[PDB]
């Protein structure tokens, strides 16, 4: 009963932790993405300015 | 936030900065064409002159 609720605290729903963890990747692809989109205002910027 | 006032303070709205810069530029150029025509009327005294 004491190994099982040290468990409890200790070990990680490593499934769960996992689908956290594509979770987290994709927000980060996600934010990388937007990033990528946020660096050509500036050009379109510059095809104004010629 | 501090990144951004300090932007909204320091940095040009380079768009309108330059519809400005296109103003300033149509304004001397066509002072210059006043210029222009206001040295053709002493021309006209001389002709009148002889």
Do not use: G, H, W, Y
Request: proline share 2%.
């Amino acid at each position: 009963n004491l190994t099982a609720a040290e468990s409890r605290i200790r070990d990680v729903d490593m499934a769960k932790e996992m689908s956290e963890f594509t979770k987290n990747n994709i927000l980060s692809q996600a934010s990388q993405a937007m990033l990528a989109q946020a660096n050509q205002q500036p050009q379109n910027v510059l095809q104004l300015l010629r």
